Amino acid sequence: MKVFKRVAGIKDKAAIKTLISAAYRQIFERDIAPYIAQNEFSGWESKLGNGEITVKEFIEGLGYSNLYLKEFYTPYPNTKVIELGTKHFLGRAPIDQAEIRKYNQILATQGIRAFINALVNSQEYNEVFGEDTVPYRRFPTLEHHHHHH
């Protein structure tokens, strides 16, 4: 039940970097070594800790990192990048085969930066995991809304 989000008062670079380490294990899936994280994102981390950027813009920027894409995109088929990508941001599986075709089409035409940006600008993300909250896995529960047809 360890909930990682930005509290209005966290100016601490240590607590910020723990929020960032959690965001790695959400998006990149792997636990990233802090000495690697300061070689890759030490310049991007300073904006989050001092407050020049939001948590949404930081995390969307982690989704743009070619380290993540080297692992879960460049050796992976585009459709598998959709389900694992949405799992890491929305915490959901893709809705229909047509939903898959749209994320697949955006990634094919624009590219990977537009694909992550589509998952993060999905209305479910901003209303639940907004510009303060980290996208944690949404429990094995998930079952809502399903009424009598």
UniProtKB/Swiss-Prot annotation:
It comes from the Bacteria. Residues 2-142 form the PBS-linker domain. It is found in: Cellular thylakoid membrane. Contains one covalently linked bilin chromophore. This protein autochromophorylates. Heterodimer of ApcF (a variant beta-allophycocyanin). Phycobilisomes of this organism are composed of a two cylinder core, from which six rods radiate. The core is mainly composed of allophycocyanin alpha and beta chains and of minor components. Belongs to the phycobilisome linker protein family. This protein is postulated to act both as terminal energy acceptor (by its phycobilin-like domains) and as a linker polypeptide (by its repeats and arms) that stabilizes the phycobilisome core architecture. Has intrinsic bilin lyase activity. This is Phycobiliprotein ApcE. It comes from Nostoc sp. (strain PCC 7120 / SAG 25.82 / UTEX 2576). The gene is apcE.
